[PDB]
């Protein structure tokens, strides 16, 4: 019925209680280093190769080594058989774990080198990315790769009003929030952080403290496993660039919006069509998001162009729309369990001048407000698509000692490390995403949360 009954969880744990965690180094013969980890229902093998010369020589870098973490899921690792090979989700995980490890590995010691980290999840519970990352640290040590700290992390979240630790798959699927965080323990700087769902500033700060406390026991399992006042433009730090929104830019779609954010220009388009719902969720419609980093937008684009970035943007934008519950996907049922409304949100980037995530969010929100779902084709009165909230994403980076928001492209590259905080008009936080190589202090993340709430308020009323 409920996930907690006696203040006791469906598997019997207290609120801040870890699942069983085991770690086992050296298990593999070929890998320079390796680690096997069991974390609740998670079984993950990690192998480490390198450092070695970078292949292909295209990707090579003369300053430092490149950390190529690859996250792969066995076909038999999830509920239903899944086709082998990467998908959008495993590439984003591979990117976000690569970036984290790039902060702890001493990449500068190995110019032109590559360090391969292979994360093979054999059976997945929830929190696989953090278990993989926690075991990668042990694998890298098992291989003798030099590091300046040992990355470790944990999840937390909200389940039936309670903040809990190390969520299960069911708590992830049906709970109110999920918050993966990895840190460098010596300093406590955050090298991985994401957040899905619905949470208050106070709840987010509590979940963080629970995670930070949890890593003390987890860092120990790792060790014993081895023992065996203005910007360059006029803008102030809280100031966005000029915006121009043009709704119904593509009248032949169901909804759309052209957005310019400074010199960053995207147009979002919404195509709503009848389709078959999920066999899991039969009384909910579908929202699928995609953001195209068109070669037209940047000179370097079609070098790389990177898809990693385009996939990351698409997920962070989708996450904000989804977790804000903007769409109200229950009102989009045509024939319960046979026909629902598929809401395609496609965003084409035509000009890139920084802050693609926020510009895309603004476009998405605006385009979803020309709602006009065509109900007249499957019966009907054409009705406006229910809009229940206004999620604003705010993206933030650190220039020197001062946090700014809406970075230009110039600011976007000067400092490694960005953080996106999406909020709704109730002052709840719905999604977060730490990006790029670089760490943030807890204070930075706290200032980020406050700044994003403040400037999102201003944003929402002005547009």
Author numbering: 9 to 236, 304 to 538
Provide the publication's sentences verbatim.
The exosome is a multiprotein complex that participates in the processing and degradation of RNA molecules.
The crystal structure of TaciRrp41:42 with a phosphate ion was solved at 2.3 Å and belonged to the P213 space group. The TaciRrp41 and TaciRrp42 structural component revealed a heterodimeric complex structure of the exosome core at 2.3 Å. Furthermore, many arginine residues from TaciRrp41 and TaciRrp42 are involved in forming a positively charged region around the inorganic phosphate.
